[PDB]
Design a protein around this ligand. Structure first.
Ligand SMILES: Nc1nc2c(ncn2[C@@H]2O[C@H](COP(=O)(O)OP(=O)(O)NP(=O)(O)O)[C@@H](O)[C@H]2O)c(=O)[nH]1
Ligand SMILES: [Mg+2]
Ligand SMILES: [Mg+2]
Ligand SMILES: [Mg+2]
Ligand SMILES: [Zn+2]
Lengths: 107, 114, 104, 79
RNA sequence: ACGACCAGGGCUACACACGUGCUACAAUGGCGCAUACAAAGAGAAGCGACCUCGCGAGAGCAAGCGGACCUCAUAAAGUGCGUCGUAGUCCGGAUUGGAGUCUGCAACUCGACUCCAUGAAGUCGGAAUCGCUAGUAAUCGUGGAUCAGAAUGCCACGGUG
């Protein structure tokens, strides 16, 4: 970093929606290299956000992303995941869905 | 519902509620429900009194009560009153079956004090 | 004016009228604590022997650590606070004497 | 611990039991077999069990049957 | 005799201190059923299938194979369904008792493993301190050396990432 000035890696996007930004979101929640169990929680959390908390699933995540703002998007997604773990609900898909609901209404 | 195991099981599933009796784990609770004919996911609700007393008879083969406390205790009293080496381990609160006593003996020794 | 002078030399030997000897000392303002570890500083005080092993952690600096039972004994009043504040002055002196190096 | 096909006992100590039954009880018998399984024909005898430097006599009791002679002799002195 | 032989004991002790690890404190999980995908090695005083018995550790019977053939050897995470619903719990497994397997002249001091039962502390850890810039970190299992037997250590190997 003192001499070695290089860029940052560009991972493959979301296979479901074609979103580059959502591919970085599932990697933060992913622990122990478990991609298969991480993306199932994120997909089920957004479907709760889409069907019962407002349409335009890709736009509904962006409104929740906008209030908590490369590094600006990185710190915003990290604050959602880490605050979702310390909640009172039952599952990780239910906790992160309520965090995106609160971030959409900036509270 | 009061069993011969007088301590009242919690109002939950059958294989979990039988575990609260001293001397019935997870495996033995499965053996009683298999011998009686009651499913393991049946709660205390709808478990009729004709289905509770048939669990009293199946558990009656095993002594699982404060009477089981004294039988474990007097088995240790057989060791300590005899004067054996293993009986000396129980009287001071030291590990018996080969655990070291340099460090990491906190369960047997009790909390630390210099 | 407000100080003391060390006129008499190192040590002169005499005898008691009953028995034993006397040894005079110089006027000394020196503190050599290069001997051993700060674990031995904990052993250098009498009443602090009986209060070891009572704090939260097994290792403790006893100044900025939460739950120090030795600090609770000073706050209770069984240990005077003059001795406690001077105790960490000994520990902060070892942050100032040790600086260059010295070894025997 | 040990398998059920035959409880182990040393041959020299088994000979010491047989003469003790016929000729009656004697002075406490010094031995080194800390690994022998106690049989019911030994009840009443006093066997001196070696523990590293000395021999400690052990009066055999009825409920000692099945145990080892090494379970009655501490090998270290603690203070 | 500072030599040598043998028996037993000690190297594994216990009021404590320190460094190094494993498993945890859990719903990104626990358990039950169903089920998919590895690479790299080891094997003749050895690996030991199939069949049969035991809840199980295993045992009996008994081939194949000095081996790209046969055996260890069904990889585990994952996937699908059901369950528990945030608690000292169907978390976590310590400790202890009882009943046993196998190794070996011989498992008390001091072995491994299975079964039943018991269910400590612990609900994410102060000052301080370490590793790591990519198939890396993290995590999942497998194999080997040592070895009659005795791996949370070490050496390798892949899976996901
Ligand atoms: N008023 C009074 N003066 C005293 C007393 N004891 C000593 N002094 C005085 O104090 C002074 C110092 O005494 P001194 O014994 O020489 O001190 P020191 O510690 O030996 N000095 P040094 O360090 O040179 O050896 C002397 O002038 C002495 O007379 C006392 O009880 N009362
Ligand atoms: Mg029970
Ligand atoms: Mg558990
Ligand atoms: Mg580098
Ligand atoms: Zn303290």
């Amino acid at each position: 970093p003192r001499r070695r000035v290089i860029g940052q890696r560009k991972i493959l996007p979301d296979p479901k929606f074609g979103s580059e930004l959502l591919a970085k979101f599932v990697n933060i929640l992913m622990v122990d290299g478990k991609k298969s169990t991480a993306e199932s929680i994120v997909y089920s959390a957004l479907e709760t956000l889409a069907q019962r908390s407002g349409k335009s699933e890709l736009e509904a995540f962006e409104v929740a992303l906008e209030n908590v703002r490369v590094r600006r998007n990185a710190l915003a997604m990290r604050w959602i995941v880490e605050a979702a773990r310390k909640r009172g609900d039952k599952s990780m898909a239910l906790r992160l869905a309520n965090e995106l609901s609160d971030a959409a209404e900036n509270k | 519902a009061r069993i011969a195991g007088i301590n009242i099981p919690d109002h939950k599933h059958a294989v979990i509620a039988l575990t609260s009796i001293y001397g019935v784990g997870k495996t033995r609770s499965k053996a009683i429900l298999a011998a009686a004919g009651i499913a393991e996911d049946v709660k205390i609700s709808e478990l009729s009194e004709g289905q509770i007393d048939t669990l009293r008879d199946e558990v009656a083969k095993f002594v699982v009560e404060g009477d089981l406390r004294r039988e474990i205790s007097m088995s240790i009293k057989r060791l300590m009153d005899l004067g054996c080496y293993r009986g000396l381990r129980h009287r001071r609160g030291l590990p018996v079956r080969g655990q070291r006593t340099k460090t990491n003996a906190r369960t047997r020794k009790g909390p630390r004090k210099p | 004016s407000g100080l003391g002078q060390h006129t008499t030399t190192a040590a002169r030997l005499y005898h008691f009228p009953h028995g034993g000897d006397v040894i005079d000392s110089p006027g000394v303002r020196e503190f050599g604590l290069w001997h051993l570890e700060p674990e031995q500083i904990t052993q250098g005080f009498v009443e602090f022997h009986d209060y070891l092993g009572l704090c939260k952690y097994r290792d403790c600096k006893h100044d900025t650590d939460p739950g120090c039972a030795i600090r609770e004994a000073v706050e209770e009043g069984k240990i005077a606070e003059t001795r406690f504040e001077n105790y960490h002055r000994i520990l902060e002196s070892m942050a100032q004497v040790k600086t260059r190096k010295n070894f025997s | 611990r040990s398998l059920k096909k035959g409880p182990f006992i040393d041959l020299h100590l088994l000979k010491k039991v047989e003469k003790a039954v016929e000729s009656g009880d004697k002075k406490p018998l010094r031995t080194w077999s800390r690994r022998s399984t106690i049989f019911p024909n030994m009840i009443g005898l006093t066997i001196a069990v070696h523990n590293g430097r000395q021999h400690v006599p052990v009066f055999v009791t009825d409920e000692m049957v099945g145990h080892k002679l090494g379970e009655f002799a501490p090998t270290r002195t603690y203070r």
